[PDB]
Amino acid sequence: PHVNVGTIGHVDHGKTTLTAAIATVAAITSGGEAKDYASIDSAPEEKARGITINTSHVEYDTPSRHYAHVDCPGHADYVKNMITGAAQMDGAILVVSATDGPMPQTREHILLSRQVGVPYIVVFMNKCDMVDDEELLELVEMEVRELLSDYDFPGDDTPIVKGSATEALKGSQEKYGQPAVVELLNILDTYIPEPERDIDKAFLMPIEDVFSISGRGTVVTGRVESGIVKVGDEIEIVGIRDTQKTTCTGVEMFRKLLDEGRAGENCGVLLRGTKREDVQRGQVLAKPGSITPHTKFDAEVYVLSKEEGGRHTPFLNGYRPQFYFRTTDVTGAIQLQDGTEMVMPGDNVEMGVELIHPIAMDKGLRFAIREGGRTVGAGVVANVNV
Amino acid sequence: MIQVESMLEVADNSGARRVQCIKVLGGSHRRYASVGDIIKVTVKEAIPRGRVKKGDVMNAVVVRTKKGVRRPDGSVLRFDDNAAVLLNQNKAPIATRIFGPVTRELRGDQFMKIVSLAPEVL
């Protein structure tokens, strides 16, 4: 199996050093590779979807499953990676320095994980080799537990493991080194449940092109991004218009029928009864009741600074840009909260959005904010309202 | 061997009946167009209520010539008419049916739907 993980926390707390530590320790039994610190600290920059991110993509595997490990060399890089969702992390290794643990970077990182929808956080504290005492370590543990509880995370039942990344790289068998990274791997292999597959999720398929075939009905094309669609499956059309019922009467690709339409492939699907003008690009096909349309929602929005292309001017309440949801752009009006009138570029906060017409969304969906074709920010849905 | 002011039969389902070469494309003083060569034509006779009106100026590809096309073994391959297939503004076939045979010099990437729809590909 495959799982995506990453180290979050305050700068200088040893996230990169710890990532190298797991790399080298997983290199035992050749599962990983002895990884140099500098190579991973030199994260390449990719300007994907008009957004530039420094991310170091570390990879390694265990007898349990393979891990995709994510590291960023700065707070802006971490925020961009979470919100643009280059690789959704279903598990986060909160790196806490044994001294000065709960810094504001960790403060905002935990909240960002909560908003973007990271389901599980595993706490690891490093720099224990610089700390000779025990009761301040316990105080730091209590602080991080309380902070996790403060943002809907378990906290009390959150596994906390203690060690030192420098000792792990050195090779010392002292409990704060290799043994520490070894348990940390154990919690990674046990506490983190196996993530759901795309083909195992509920069926969903955004509609990109609407056809019609004589004798067959209405054909809508698009890449199925979850579940499976088969002839005889009851499906519903959700999006711009009000939800309509239909039934699958055929799945075809290149004018040839398929046994079923699986997630990840650009299959076309036939609809029963629906007309060529009763459905349009932007709507999605979903299992009945799996998703619902909404115009008002609250999202974690990162405003691109001018350095990423971005935008010269700040966001403000009443700004109404275009919002892009997987196949379509829709005008939404930015609605800030009390005490947020000005929203500086390069920052990230939670805003409410009111779309001009409903879009099939649910918590965790990601979208781009643009005007004139220039990306001015990225976002992720954190709550939907009616 | 098609040159300017030479009439060509239309070998596709485009509505044109006869076209006249008004330019041999691909060179400053290029004289002749054989099979596979792109020419500029004016449609001289068209079918009523068709895709192409009489008097349009557009692109065509030569698909068979009366002079003939040579093969590597030295053989020549001659036809009884000079025929063309009308093309798009980006030099792509606008045909859903091809009439008569075409030669195998149309193999490539841009004249593939002309070879697949041809009744016979020599």
Added chain:
Amino acid sequence: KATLKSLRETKANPAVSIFVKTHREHPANDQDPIALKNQLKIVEERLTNEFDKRTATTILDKIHAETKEYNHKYNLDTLAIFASVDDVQLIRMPLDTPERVVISNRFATRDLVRDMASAVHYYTVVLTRDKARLIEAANDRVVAEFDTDNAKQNNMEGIPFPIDNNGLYTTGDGGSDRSANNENSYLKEFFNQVDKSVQELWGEHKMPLVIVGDVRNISYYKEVCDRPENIIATVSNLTELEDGNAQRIIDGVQDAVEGYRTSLHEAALGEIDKARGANALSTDLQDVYRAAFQGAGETLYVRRGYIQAAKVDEDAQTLTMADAAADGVTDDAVGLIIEHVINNGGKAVFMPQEMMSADQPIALVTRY
């Protein structure tokens, strides 16, 4: 007071602007009195609801005294009424605007601004094989004709207009009899001299020029012109080039003058793209309002006929969308943008509907 720069000056409260669609000929102009009265009804009911009956029934009588004596057969494209207490101005303009009533502090002069922005001042060079004329024109009318009593010709060193082609071959004197076939070179050098006179007059006032004549005449002129980048259009199908009136030629160049005005709007698309790529272009309505209000607006690009009502308060500079335009909002929120951009030394360009997108109807090139 019937000008743009008196209506921008006057600050009444309330200041009523009424726009009525009228027609130039009969029987189309038969519904002009009805449309005028219909607009006066909505504005009279708006004033009695917004301020009071007394203000409504003094403003309405002030405009009724003016509109009582109205022919309605000499109507232009629109009838604009600018009214207040103790003042009513009645101007007919040749532009097409949608019927609206604007009640605000200002006098809703966005269409006057848009008509002043669509104003071409050019030269008309009239070429024949026999003579040459020069007409200086402002839009549809001629400013002058460059006669021998024009006085912009006083201190000239070239031949002044009208320029007779009195070359040696035209009269038969000199040499080089017809068999040498130098007629083309004689015409080319005569048009070179005509262009010398044109350039000597242009250097003093630098307007664009339209070239009018036969195809071969204007082509010979384009061969020979010393500054061929100042030419905007050539018109070869104009008639009566020697005896014709100066106005008559100006009439025949109108299609070319409008084609040039359309080209000057297609060329603004590249300016908008340059602003967008330099991150100096604001397109949100609230963004454009803020930028224009704090003096950052360099050029405003407004789609033709784009009107929007919004709740504007400049103390906090928040332009929220209106609901019914009956709650105390500003009727023309985009006309307020146009006024602020003109106030802060900017330009407003009113872009036609087929070059500007319907969904992105406004675009402001900012100063930073």
Added chain:
RNA sequence: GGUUGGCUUAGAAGCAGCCAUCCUUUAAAGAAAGCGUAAUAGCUCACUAGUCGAGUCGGCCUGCGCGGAAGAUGUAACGG
């Protein structure tokens, strides 16, 4: 340092433009000779002190030179 001189201007903060050239800590520092900014910001300069140590700086006139200086049969504008 008063000080973003005053005015004007969307902005005019030494440096768009118009009217003065003031005072203070001074060894010295212009209500600024340039670059830069939308305006600020920022980098210089004038000026002063320090280091090194002997001549140096800029105008005027005169003579002879340099560039400005591209054509058609062949060098081809000292006859060679």
Added chain:
RNA sequence: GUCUGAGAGGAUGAUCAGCCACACCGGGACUGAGACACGGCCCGGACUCCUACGGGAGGCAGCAGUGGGGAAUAUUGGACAAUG
């Protein structure tokens, strides 16, 4: 026959019944008591489809139904229990 009209007339020819003609378009016949044959043959054609490019297949104006056209007209039902 139907509507109308006092009638004479006028208009009309859905559903029911009789007769006729047609069965993607043109032509020829075969077999048979009976056809120049709605879900048969042959040839030709237009269109649609399959193909390994050599070749092949098909005809809802039967009943459901689809796309399309339209102002507008229905179920992709059950049974041979009854009359045939």
